[PDB]
Amino acid sequence: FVKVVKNKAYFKRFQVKYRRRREGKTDYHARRQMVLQDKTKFGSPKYRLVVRITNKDIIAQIVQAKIVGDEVVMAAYAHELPAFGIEHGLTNYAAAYATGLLLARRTLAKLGIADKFQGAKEADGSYSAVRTKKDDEGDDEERFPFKAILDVGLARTTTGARVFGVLKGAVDGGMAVPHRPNRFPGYNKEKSSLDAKVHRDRIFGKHVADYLKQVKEEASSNPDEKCVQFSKYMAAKVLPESIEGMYKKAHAAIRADPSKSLPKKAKVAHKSYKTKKLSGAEKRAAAKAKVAAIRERL
Amino acid sequence: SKAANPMREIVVKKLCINICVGESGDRLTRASKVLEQLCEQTPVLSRARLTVRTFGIRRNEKIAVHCTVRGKKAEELLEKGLKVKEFELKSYNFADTGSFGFGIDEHIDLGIKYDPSTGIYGMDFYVVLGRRGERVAHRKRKCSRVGHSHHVTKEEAMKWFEKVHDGIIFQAKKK
Amino acid sequence: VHSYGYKSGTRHLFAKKFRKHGVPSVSTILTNIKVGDYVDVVADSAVREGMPHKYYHGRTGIVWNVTPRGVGVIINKPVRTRTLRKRICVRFEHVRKSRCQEAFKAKEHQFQAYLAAKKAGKALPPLQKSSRLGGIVRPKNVEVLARRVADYEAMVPY
RNA sequence: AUGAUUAGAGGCUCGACCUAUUCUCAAACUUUAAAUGUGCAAACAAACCGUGCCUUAGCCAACUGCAAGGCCGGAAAGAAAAGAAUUAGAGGCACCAAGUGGGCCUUCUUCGGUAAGCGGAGCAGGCGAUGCGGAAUGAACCGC
RNA sequence: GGGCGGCAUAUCUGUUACACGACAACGCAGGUGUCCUAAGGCGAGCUCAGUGGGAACAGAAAUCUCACGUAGAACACAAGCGUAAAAGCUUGCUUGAUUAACGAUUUCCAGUACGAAUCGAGACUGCGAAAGCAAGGCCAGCGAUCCUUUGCGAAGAAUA
RNA sequence: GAGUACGACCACACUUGAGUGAAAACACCAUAUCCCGUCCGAUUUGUGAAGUUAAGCACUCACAGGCUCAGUUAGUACUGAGGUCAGUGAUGACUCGGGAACCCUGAGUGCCGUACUCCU
RNA sequence: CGCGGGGUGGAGCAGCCUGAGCUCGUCGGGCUCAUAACCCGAAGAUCGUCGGUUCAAAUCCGGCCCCCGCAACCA
Ligand SMILES: [K+]
Ligand SMILES: [Mg+2]
Ligand SMILES: [Mg+2]
Ligand SMILES: [Mg+2]
Ligand SMILES: [Mg+2]
Ligand SMILES: [Mg+2]
Ligand SMILES: [Mg+2]
Ligand SMILES: [Mg+2]
Ligand SMILES: [Mg+2]
Ligand SMILES: [Mg+2]
Ligand SMILES: [Mg+2]
Ligand SMILES: [Mg+2]
Ligand SMILES: [Mg+2]
Ligand SMILES: [Mg+2]
Ligand SMILES: [Mg+2]
Ligand SMILES: [Mg+2]
Ligand SMILES: [Mg+2]
Ligand SMILES: [Mg+2]
Ligand SMILES: [Mg+2]
Ligand code: NA
Ligand code: NA
Ligand code: NA
């Protein structure tokens, strides 16, 4: 036989990682630096623009750290976009931009500084330096916009990622998130320049429209082959030439009434589904019954 | 019932082709061209981890060229390799992890046009069998362990070879 | 032989407890330290920046200066026939809020509550009595205390 | 766990290998962990209370929030009760200088050495600098 | 005793050392006068030492693959400590190894220097999407007076 | 009674087998035109929703291994203070105080926040 | 005992400053009636021993088994 590595001494000396490290959720090395701030500020508020993307939804939150636990100041979800006219593609770049815009408008409304910081009403996909206490840009006396720092968790920070789509939406909503345009879609690293047209096209979903059109030609070419890509798109009859207008109207609707969410049914006790734990006395009794049964057989 | 779930269907995750020339230079270059032609993708070289006197290898010296093939090309290459093998494998060729492998002595038998320059080379075929849902052990976020019941065993691998390739297993112990 | 470097003879002093390794957590980072607060200087051997000298480990003092990453602590240190107030510069990961004044703060707060109750006419809590006073004892189990033969055999092994 | 170490047993005629044990250990090994210690606090330049006030080129997106220096008021068993301190406790601040900078002994701790009235340290007492009363006699022991 | 030897002569780690700190011997076990434009800085990705099963030559030992793997590896050296989505490995970009208004402080300590350190403030930067992180390689690796020698006080503007 | 995101403490939360899982989630999953990255769309990135609870994930179970808190070990080991105490010594006991550890054994197997959602 | 040097094919000796040579000797075949000389070829190491470092140790650093020296002074 072979030596057993995971023996009793191994378990006695084993030190477990943090719970969220074991579950693979929190990069605590990055979290420590994000929640860190100058000790001379004496715990003044600092906010993390938390961006998380599941397979079906986009979660955007304004989170302020406490010892007792983080506090979510405001949250926005891509699944609430149907309330604003987006029924499809709730995980694409356009939905990410809208979710960031939705979170920004809701946060500024709650703080009461909306209608003062309106951001960019029309998205051109270009970059502008955010106003922050760190960069006075001339020590002007204009009121600084609300500031949060982007948190992307364990997501790979590549060029054109949807996490920066949420970032672009938030900054266009009037929020001050420090960032450089190096990771926006359409940015060229060799020329060190940003192509605002390409960024704007992905913001308004032209790439989805072009892909949707091409698949429709393929579906028409081969009807006998069952088609899965864009299946709900075709079933809902979403023409490729209406996607850009739909997202434009969604941006206007978000700015018009950010507090709107999915309609809530007018609402009963909680039905239990948990399986009851056995008690120690029950477990000892069952073990004794097994031992006695083996004794009776022997 | 639970074993009849469509997500337990055993599939070929990848096919790994390895050529260990062990000398570096023109022979390794020609082996790289042969592997690139077969796999329709550029290969990746391997350097020697240590220096060994009897094998003529020094540490960090490039000695091997290998490639990983997935999808339809992997299945097509596997059928070619099994055809050279007459679809007959030994029982000990199968690992306890569900994967198996075999070796080809000459690359001409794979339906490859011989070239007087590149010469002939032998290769190692290794097939990694698996199921859907193994991503949970290789993803970045929330990486976890695949359930013990979801793993492919050696017995299931031989049953897969028999059922899907009409293979024959010679029950033997390696000498 | 023995040398006198900065970290000489700190093998056991500057070491993590068993199964308690790791860098400082978020709670230390979120701690607010103010000028005038009492802090305990405890070195965190996993940091190794801003780390106090071995003498100041386990000492309590008053913060006199706060910087973005550091804390200035005034520590009493006896030298010859006098006590010096040494101002050591450390990082915030090596200071913990001191509880040396916890009892006194509770005593002051209790006094204010008692004074407020007295000025508001609220009934005062009863005063605890001494356990050293005489009294009558009614036993429920009385046993003979004596040395038995079996006690001597019970202390002989083998 | 790291090192050291004795011997059976069970698994896979010997051996090896693995498993659970077993005999015995560590100034430069440790999960655990005292006693004796060591730092701080225990209300008079302080601290506590006030939708109190004034200032800041400080923090914060702002502020009535935070940081700081003050001003104006308030309350103060002046620190209860619970074993809930004690003091032959005038605190601080200087100035000018002498002799000394060979030590030795002892209770406990302790290193080198077979050991030594041997060499070398720790805490504290003592002799040196000091007799007196005791151990017959003895710088260091007992008492003082 | 002195000589011979050695160095306990400046200095670093563990132990002696008696659970704050401090402590002797020509006590014990070992180090230092170097080395690195990367072996410095930063971001990202990755996980190490070893095992087990399996694959032409191929065998103890070449490379490929999959599981286990609390660090049993690695971090220029001696040692201790520390570190696992790193402080290790790989790689992409870099020069924070520059300058730094006589700021303050620790270690030695007479609370003097010297050497190593710590916390800053200002300039100009690097890396990063961003919080941030860096003014060398954490802690050993070094030098007064006098003398010698080099750098800085560019150009032009001021009726003074 | 549950889920998701961010979390505080970081095993009462880990590890090994086994079973169960309403709703909504989460997740596997489908795919490669474009953004992006690889020998390999495995990872990663983008775009999707035909399928599945088979895995992850969550609960429950084990005279389970660990871990946590108690008892026991034991007033034992050791120790502050004392003797013109015992003993040739080694050392030991006594007097006024303090007081461990493993084995063993009993009980337990996460807990607490913010926001949104399901049950409704 | 203190300081220093040295263990290499059968013999003597290089290389001793990481990746085995010299002469003699031995073996085979020639030349001679034969031996020697002479000519043509061949074989022979694991660098005294045990550890450590290194991808790699005759080599570098430690202990051991031996060998050889220089010192062991003032009374
Ligand atoms: K002169
Ligand atoms: Mg990161
Ligand atoms: Mg110690
Ligand atoms: Mg300690
Ligand atoms: Mg105390
Ligand atoms: Mg009282
Ligand atoms: Mg007398
Ligand atoms: Mg002590
Ligand atoms: Mg000490
Ligand atoms: Mg990193
Ligand atoms: Mg100065
Ligand atoms: Mg240095
Ligand atoms: Mg150094
Ligand atoms: Mg340094
Ligand atoms: Mg369901
Ligand atoms: Mg995939
Ligand atoms: Mg499942
Ligand atoms: Mg199941
Ligand atoms: Mg158990
Ligand atoms: Na005497
Ligand atoms: Na700076
Ligand atoms: Na000089």
Coordinates of all heavy atoms in Angstrom, one line a residue, chain A residues 11 20 26 28 31 52 61 67 70 93 162 232-233 264 273 278 284, chain F residues 1 5-8 10-11 26 46-49 61 107 110 113-114 117:
Chain A
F11 N -4.9 16.4 9.8 CA -6.1 17.1 10.1 C -5.9 18.0 11.4 O -6.5 19.1 11.5 CB -7.3 16.2 10.3 CG -7.8 15.5 9.1 CD1 -7.6 14.1 8.9 CD2 -8.3 16.2 8.0 CE1 -8.0 13.5 7.7 CE2 -8.7 15.6 6.8 CZ -8.6 14.3 6.7
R20 N -14.8 32.6 2.7 CA -15.0 33.0 1.3 C -13.8 32.7 0.4 O -14.0 32.7 -0.8 CB -15.3 34.5 1.3 CG -16.5 34.9 2.2 CD -17.1 36.2 1.7 NE -18.5 36.0 1.2 CZ -18.9 36.4 0.0 NH1 -18.1 37.2 -0.8 NH2 -20.1 36.2 -0.4
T26 N -14.0 35.6 -2.6 CA -13.3 36.9 -2.2 C -11.8 36.8 -2.3 O -11.2 35.9 -1.7 CB -13.7 37.3 -0.8 OG1 -15.1 37.6 -0.7 CG2 -13.0 38.5 -0.3
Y28 N -9.1 38.2 -0.9 CA -8.9 39.0 0.3 C -7.7 39.9 0.2 O -7.7 41.0 0.8 CB -8.8 38.1 1.5 CG -10.2 37.8 2.1 CD1 -10.7 36.6 1.9 CD2 -10.8 38.7 2.9 CE1 -12.0 36.2 2.4 CE2 -12.1 38.4 3.5 CZ -12.6 37.1 3.2 OH -13.9 36.8 3.7
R31 N -9.2 42.7 -1.6 CA -10.2 43.4 -0.7 C -9.6 44.2 0.4 O -10.1 45.3 0.7 CB -11.1 42.3 -0.1 CG -12.1 42.8 1.0 CD -13.0 41.8 1.5 NE -13.9 42.3 2.6 CZ -14.8 43.1 2.4 NH1 -15.1 43.6 1.2 NH2 -15.5 43.5 3.5
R52 N -20.8 42.3 -10.2 CA -20.8 40.9 -10.3 C -21.7 40.4 -11.4 O -22.8 40.9 -11.5 CB -21.1 40.3 -8.9 CG -20.2 40.6 -7.8 CD -18.9 39.9 -7.9 NE -17.9 40.2 -6.8 CZ -17.2 41.3 -6.8 NH1 -17.2 42.2 -7.8 NH2 -16.4 41.6 -5.8
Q61 N -23.7 47.1 -7.2 CA -24.0 47.5 -5.8 C -23.1 48.6 -5.4 O -21.9 48.6 -5.8 CB -24.0 46.3 -4.9 CG -25.1 45.3 -5.1 CD -24.9 44.1 -4.2 OE1 -23.8 43.4 -4.3 NE2 -25.8 43.8 -3.3
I67 N -17.1 46.8 10.1 CA -16.6 45.7 10.8 C -17.7 44.6 11.0 O -17.5 43.4 10.9 CB -16.0 46.1 12.2 CG1 -14.8 47.0 11.9 CG2 -15.7 44.9 13.1 CD1 -14.1 47.4 13.2
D70 N -20.6 44.4 5.5 CA -20.7 45.4 4.5 C -22.2 45.9 4.4 O -23.1 45.1 4.6 CB -20.3 44.9 3.1 CG -18.8 44.8 3.0 OD1 -18.1 45.1 4.0 OD2 -18.3 44.4 1.9
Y93 N -23.1 43.5 -23.3 CA -22.4 44.7 -22.9 C -23.4 45.9 -22.8 O -23.3 46.7 -21.9 CB -21.3 45.1 -23.9 CG -20.4 46.1 -23.5 CD1 -19.2 45.8 -22.8 CD2 -20.6 47.5 -23.6 CE1 -18.3 46.7 -22.4 CE2 -19.7 48.4 -23.2 CZ -18.6 48.0 -22.6 OH -17.7 49.0 -22.1
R162 N -17.5 43.2 -19.7 CA -18.8 43.8 -19.2 C -18.7 44.5 -17.9 O -19.5 45.3 -17.6 CB -19.9 42.7 -19.2 CG -20.4 42.2 -20.5 CD -20.2 40.8 -20.7 NE -21.3 40.0 -20.1 CZ -21.2 38.8 -19.6 NH1 -20.0 38.3 -19.4 NH2 -22.2 38.2 -19.1
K232 N -34.9 32.7 -28.2 CA -35.9 33.6 -27.7 C -36.0 34.9 -28.5 O -37.0 35.6 -28.6 CB -35.7 33.9 -26.2 CG -35.8 32.7 -25.3 CD -35.5 33.0 -23.9 CE -35.9 31.9 -23.0 NZ -35.4 32.1 -21.6
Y233 N -34.9 35.3 -29.1 CA -34.8 36.5 -29.9 C -35.8 36.3 -31.1 O -36.6 37.2 -31.4 CB -33.4 36.8 -30.4 CG -32.6 37.7 -29.5 CD1 -32.1 37.2 -28.3 CD2 -32.5 39.1 -29.8 CE1 -31.3 38.0 -27.5 CE2 -31.7 39.9 -28.9 CZ -31.2 39.4 -27.8 OH -30.5 40.2 -26.9
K264 N -44.5 44.2 -8.6 CA -44.6 43.4 -7.4 C -46.0 42.9 -7.2 O -46.9 43.8 -7.1 CB -44.0 44.0 -6.2 CG -42.6 44.7 -6.4 CD -42.0 45.2 -5.2 CE -41.4 44.0 -4.4 NZ -40.4 43.2 -5.2
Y273 N -39.5 23.7 4.9 CA -38.9 22.6 4.1 C -37.7 22.0 4.7 O -37.2 21.1 4.1 CB -38.6 23.1 2.7 CG -39.8 23.4 1.8 CD1 -40.5 24.6 2.0 CD2 -40.3 22.5 0.9 CE1 -41.6 24.9 1.2 CE2 -41.4 22.7 0.2 CZ -42.1 23.9 0.3 OH -43.2 24.2 -0.5
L278 N -31.5 15.3 13.9 CA -31.6 14.4 15.0 C -30.9 14.9 16.3 O -30.0 15.7 16.2 CB -31.0 13.0 14.6 CG -32.0 12.0 14.0 CD1 -32.7 12.5 12.8 CD2 -31.2 10.7 13.6
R284 N -27.4 8.4 19.7 CA -26.9 7.3 20.6 C -27.8 6.1 20.6 O -27.4 4.9 20.6 CB -26.7 7.8 22.0 CG -25.2 7.9 22.4 CD -24.9 9.1 23.3 NE -25.2 10.4 22.7 CZ -25.7 11.4 23.3 NH1 -26.1 11.3 24.6 NH2 -25.8 12.6 22.7
Chain F
rG1 P -37.2 29.3 10.6 OP1 -37.8 28.5 11.7 OP2 -37.5 30.8 10.6 O5' -37.6 28.7 9.2 C5' -37.9 27.3 9.1 C4' -38.1 26.9 7.6 O4' -39.2 27.6 7.0 C3' -36.9 27.2 6.7 O3' -35.8 26.3 6.9 C2' -37.5 27.3 5.3 O2' -37.7 26.0 4.9 C1' -38.8 27.9 5.7 N9 -38.8 29.4 5.5 C8 -38.8 30.3 6.5 N7 -38.8 31.6 6.0 C5 -38.7 31.4 4.6 C6 -38.6 32.4 3.6 O6 -38.6 33.6 3.7 N1 -38.6 31.8 2.3 C2 -38.6 30.4 2.1 N2 -38.6 30.0 0.8 N3 -38.7 29.5 3.0 C4 -38.7 30.1 4.3
rA5 P -23.7 34.5 -5.3 OP1 -22.7 34.0 -6.3 OP2 -23.7 33.8 -3.9 O5' -23.5 36.0 -5.1 C5' -23.6 36.9 -6.2 C4' -23.5 38.3 -5.7 O4' -24.8 38.8 -5.1 C3' -22.5 38.6 -4.6 O3' -21.2 38.8 -5.1 C2' -23.1 39.9 -4.0 O2' -22.8 41.0 -4.8 C1' -24.6 39.7 -4.1 N9 -25.0 39.0 -2.8 C8 -25.2 37.7 -2.6 N7 -25.7 37.4 -1.4 C5 -25.7 38.7 -0.8 C6 -26.1 39.1 0.5 N6 -26.5 38.2 1.5 N1 -26.1 40.4 0.8 C2 -25.7 41.3 -0.1 N3 -25.3 41.0 -1.4 C4 -25.3 39.7 -1.6
rC6 P -20.0 38.3 -4.3 OP1 -18.8 38.2 -5.1 OP2 -20.4 37.0 -3.5 O5' -19.7 39.4 -3.2 C5' -19.5 40.8 -3.6 C4' -19.7 41.7 -2.5 O4' -21.1 41.7 -2.0 C3' -18.9 41.4 -1.2 O3' -17.6 41.9 -1.3 C2' -19.7 42.1 -0.1 O2' -19.5 43.5 -0.2 C1' -21.2 41.9 -0.6 N1 -21.8 40.7 0.0 C2 -22.3 40.8 1.3 O2 -22.2 41.9 1.9 N3 -22.8 39.7 1.9 C4 -22.9 38.6 1.3 N4 -23.4 37.5 1.9 C5 -22.4 38.4 -0.1 C6 -21.8 39.5 -0.6
rG7 P -16.4 40.9 -0.9 OP1 -15.1 41.5 -1.3 OP2 -16.7 39.5 -1.3 O5' -16.4 40.9 0.7 C5' -17.2 40.1 1.5 C4' -17.8 40.9 2.7 O4' -19.2 40.7 2.8 C3' -17.3 40.4 4.1 O3' -16.0 40.9 4.4 C2' -18.4 40.9 5.0 O2' -18.2 42.3 5.3 C1' -19.6 40.6 4.2 N9 -20.2 39.3 4.4 C8 -20.2 38.2 3.5 N7 -20.8 37.2 4.0 C5 -21.2 37.6 5.3 C6 -21.9 36.9 6.3 O6 -22.3 35.7 6.3 N1 -22.1 37.7 7.5 C2 -21.7 39.0 7.6 N2 -21.9 39.6 8.8 N3 -21.0 39.7 6.7 C4 -20.8 38.9 5.6
rA8 P -14.9 40.1 5.3 OP1 -13.6 40.7 5.1 OP2 -15.1 38.6 4.9 O5' -15.4 40.3 6.8 C5' -15.4 41.6 7.4 C4' -15.9 41.5 8.8 O4' -17.3 41.3 8.8 C3' -15.3 40.4 9.7 O3' -14.0 40.8 10.2 C2' -16.4 40.2 10.7 O2' -16.3 41.3 11.7 C1' -17.6 40.4 9.9 N9 -18.2 39.2 9.4 C8 -18.1 38.7 8.1 N7 -18.7 37.5 7.9 C5 -19.1 37.2 9.2 C6 -19.7 36.0 9.7 N6 -20.1 35.0 8.9 N1 -20.0 36.0 11.0 C2 -19.7 37.1 11.7 N3 -19.1 38.2 11.4 C4 -18.8 38.2 10.1
rC10 P -10.7 35.7 13.5 OP1 -9.9 35.3 14.7 OP2 -10.2 36.7 12.5 O5' -11.2 34.4 12.8 C5' -11.6 33.2 13.5 C4' -12.1 32.2 12.5 O4' -13.0 32.8 11.5 C3' -11.0 31.4 11.7 O3' -11.5 30.1 11.5 C2' -11.0 32.2 10.4 O2' -10.5 31.4 9.3 C1' -12.4 32.5 10.2 N1 -12.6 33.7 9.4 C2 -13.2 33.6 8.1 O2 -13.6 32.5 7.8 N3 -13.4 34.7 7.4 C4 -13.0 35.9 7.8 N4 -13.2 37.0 7.1 C5 -12.4 36.1 9.1 C6 -12.2 35.0 9.8
rA11 P -11.1 28.9 12.5 OP1 -11.7 29.2 13.9 OP2 -9.6 28.6 12.4 O5' -11.9 27.6 12.0 C5' -13.3 27.7 11.6 C4' -13.9 26.4 11.6 O4' -13.3 25.5 10.7 C3' -13.9 25.6 13.0 O3' -14.9 26.0 13.9 C2' -14.0 24.2 12.5 O2' -15.4 23.9 12.2 C1' -13.2 24.2 11.2 N9 -11.8 23.8 11.4 C8 -10.8 24.6 11.5 N7 -9.6 24.0 11.6 C5 -10.0 22.6 11.6 C6 -9.2 21.5 11.7 N6 -7.9 21.4 11.9 N1 -9.9 20.3 11.7 C2 -11.2 20.3 11.5 N3 -12.0 21.4 11.4 C4 -11.3 22.5 11.5
rC26 P -29.2 33.8 -11.2 OP1 -28.6 35.2 -11.5 OP2 -29.9 33.1 -12.2 O5' -27.9 32.9 -10.7 C5' -27.3 33.3 -9.5 C4' -26.6 32.1 -8.9 O4' -27.6 31.2 -8.3 C3' -25.8 31.2 -9.8 O3' -24.5 31.7 -10.1 C2' -25.8 29.9 -9.1 O2' -24.8 29.9 -8.0 C1' -27.2 29.8 -8.5 N1 -28.1 29.1 -9.4 C2 -28.1 27.7 -9.4 O2 -27.2 27.1 -8.7 N3 -28.9 27.0 -10.2 C4 -29.8 27.7 -11.0 N4 -30.6 27.0 -11.7 C5 -29.9 29.1 -10.9 C6 -29.0 29.8 -10.1
rG46 P -16.9 39.2 -21.2 OP1 -17.2 40.5 -20.5 OP2 -17.2 38.0 -20.4 O5' -17.6 39.2 -22.6 C5' -17.3 40.2 -23.6 C4' -17.7 39.7 -24.9 O4' -17.0 38.5 -25.3 C3' -19.2 39.3 -25.1 O3' -20.0 40.5 -25.3 C2' -19.1 38.4 -26.4 O2' -19.0 39.2 -27.6 C1' -17.8 37.7 -26.1 N9 -18.0 36.4 -25.5 C8 -17.7 36.0 -24.2 N7 -18.0 34.7 -24.0 C5 -18.5 34.3 -25.2 C6 -19.1 33.0 -25.6 O6 -19.1 32.0 -24.9 N1 -19.5 33.0 -26.9 C2 -19.5 34.0 -27.7 N2 -20.0 33.8 -29.0 N3 -19.0 35.2 -27.4 C4 -18.6 35.3 -26.1
rU47 P -21.5 40.4 -24.8 OP1 -22.1 41.8 -25.1 OP2 -21.5 40.0 -23.4 O5' -22.3 39.4 -25.7 C5' -22.6 39.6 -27.0 C4' -23.2 38.4 -27.7 O4' -22.3 37.3 -27.7 C3' -24.4 37.8 -27.1 O3' -25.6 38.5 -27.3 C2' -24.4 36.4 -27.6 O2' -24.9 36.4 -29.0 C1' -22.9 36.1 -27.7 N1 -22.5 35.4 -26.4 C2 -22.7 34.0 -26.4 O2 -23.3 33.4 -27.3 N3 -22.3 33.4 -25.2 C4 -21.7 34.0 -24.1 O4 -21.4 33.3 -23.2 C5 -21.5 35.4 -24.3 C6 -21.9 36.0 -25.4
rG48 P -26.9 38.4 -26.3 OP1 -28.1 39.0 -27.0 OP2 -26.4 38.9 -25.0 O5' -27.1 36.8 -26.1 C5' -28.3 36.2 -26.6 C4' -28.1 34.7 -26.9 O4' -26.8 34.3 -26.4 C3' -29.0 33.8 -26.2 O3' -30.3 33.6 -26.9 C2' -28.2 32.5 -26.1 O2' -28.4 31.7 -27.3 C1' -26.8 33.0 -26.0 N9 -26.2 32.9 -24.7 C8 -25.6 33.9 -23.9 N7 -25.2 33.5 -22.8 C5 -25.4 32.1 -22.8 C6 -25.1 31.1 -21.8 O6 -24.5 31.3 -20.7 N1 -25.5 29.9 -22.2 C2 -26.1 29.6 -23.3 N2 -26.4 28.3 -23.5 N3 -26.4 30.5 -24.3 C4 -26.0 31.7 -23.9
rA49 P -31.7 33.6 -26.1 OP1 -32.7 33.7 -27.2 OP2 -31.6 34.6 -25.0 O5' -31.7 32.1 -25.5 C5' -31.9 31.0 -26.3 C4' -32.0 29.7 -25.5 O4' -30.8 29.6 -24.7 C3' -33.2 29.6 -24.6 O3' -33.6 28.2 -24.5 C2' -32.7 30.1 -23.3 O2' -33.4 29.6 -22.2 C1' -31.2 29.6 -23.3 N9 -30.3 30.4 -22.6 C8 -30.1 31.8 -22.7 N7 -29.2 32.3 -21.9 C5 -28.8 31.2 -21.2 C6 -27.8 31.1 -20.2 N6 -27.1 32.1 -19.7 N1 -27.6 29.8 -19.7 C2 -28.3 28.8 -20.2 N3 -29.2 28.8 -21.1 C4 -29.4 30.0 -21.6
rC61 P -28.6 15.1 11.4 OP1 -29.2 15.0 12.7 OP2 -27.5 16.0 11.2 O5' -28.1 13.6 11.0 C5' -29.1 12.5 10.8 C4' -28.5 11.4 10.1 O4' -28.2 11.8 8.7 C3' -27.2 10.8 10.6 O3' -27.4 9.9 11.7 C2' -26.6 10.1 9.4 O2' -27.2 8.9 9.1 C1' -27.1 11.1 8.2 N1 -26.0 12.0 7.8 C2 -25.0 11.6 6.9 O2 -25.0 10.4 6.6 N3 -24.0 12.4 6.5 C4 -24.0 13.7 7.0 N4 -23.1 14.5 6.6 C5 -25.0 14.2 7.9 C6 -26.0 13.3 8.3
rA107 P -22.9 12.3 25.7 OP1 -24.3 11.9 25.9 OP2 -22.0 11.6 24.7 O5' -22.9 13.9 25.3 C5' -23.9 14.7 25.8 C4' -23.6 16.2 25.5 O4' -22.3 16.5 25.9 C3' -23.7 16.6 24.0 O3' -25.0 16.8 23.6 C2' -22.9 17.9 24.0 O2' -23.6 19.0 24.5 C1' -21.8 17.5 25.0 N9 -20.6 17.0 24.3 C8 -20.2 15.7 24.2 N7 -19.1 15.5 23.5 C5 -18.7 16.8 23.2 C6 -17.6 17.3 22.5 N6 -16.6 16.6 21.9 N1 -17.6 18.6 22.3 C2 -18.5 19.4 22.8 N3 -19.6 19.0 23.5 C4 -19.6 17.7 23.7
rG110 P -23.0 22.5 11.2 OP1 -24.4 22.3 11.4 OP2 -22.2 21.8 10.2 O5' -22.7 24.1 10.9 C5' -23.6 25.1 11.5 C4' -22.9 25.9 12.5 O4' -21.6 26.2 12.1 C3' -23.5 27.2 12.8 O3' -24.6 27.2 13.7 C2' -22.3 28.0 13.4 O2' -22.1 27.7 14.7 C1' -21.2 27.5 12.5 N9 -20.8 28.3 11.4 C8 -21.1 28.0 10.1 N7 -20.6 29.0 9.2 C5 -20.0 29.9 10.1 C6 -19.4 31.1 9.8 O6 -19.2 31.6 8.7 N1 -18.9 31.8 10.9 C2 -19.1 31.3 12.2 N2 -18.6 32.0 13.2 N3 -19.7 30.1 12.5 C4 -20.1 29.5 11.4
rG113 P -28.2 39.6 13.6 OP1 -29.1 40.3 14.5 OP2 -28.7 38.6 12.6 O5' -27.3 40.7 12.9 C5' -27.7 41.2 11.6 C4' -26.6 42.0 11.0 O4' -25.5 41.2 10.6 C3' -27.0 42.7 9.7 O3' -27.7 43.9 9.9 C2' -25.6 42.9 9.0 O2' -25.0 44.1 9.6 C1' -24.9 41.7 9.4 N9 -25.0 40.6 8.4 C8 -25.4 39.3 8.6 N7 -25.4 38.6 7.6 C5 -24.8 39.4 6.6 C6 -24.5 39.1 5.2 O6 -24.7 38.1 4.6 N1 -24.0 40.3 4.6 C2 -23.7 41.5 5.2 N2 -23.2 42.4 4.5 N3 -24.0 41.7 6.5 C4 -24.6 40.6 7.1
rU114 P -29.2 44.0 9.2 OP1 -30.0 45.0 10.1 OP2 -29.7 42.7 8.9 O5' -28.9 44.8 7.8 C5' -28.2 46.0 7.8 C4' -27.6 46.2 6.4 O4' -26.6 45.3 6.1 C3' -28.6 46.0 5.3 O3' -29.5 47.2 5.1 C2' -27.7 45.8 4.1 O2' -27.1 47.0 3.6 C1' -26.6 44.9 4.7 N1 -26.8 43.5 4.6 C2 -26.5 42.9 3.4 O2 -26.1 43.5 2.4 N3 -26.8 41.5 3.3 C4 -27.3 40.7 4.3 O4 -27.4 39.5 4.1 C5 -27.6 41.4 5.5 C6 -27.4 42.7 5.6
rU117 P -37.1 43.2 -4.4 OP1 -38.0 43.8 -5.4 OP2 -37.3 43.4 -3.0 O5' -37.0 41.6 -4.6 C5' -36.9 41.0 -5.9 C4' -36.6 39.6 -5.9 O4' -35.5 39.3 -5.0 C3' -37.6 38.6 -5.4 O3' -38.6 38.3 -6.3 C2' -36.8 37.4 -5.0 O2' -36.5 36.6 -6.1 C1' -35.6 38.0 -4.4 N1 -35.6 38.1 -2.9 C2 -35.4 36.9 -2.2 O2 -35.1 35.9 -2.8 N3 -35.4 37.0 -0.9 C4 -35.6 38.2 -0.1 O4 -35.6 38.1 1.1 C5 -35.9 39.3 -0.9 C6 -35.8 39.3 -2.3

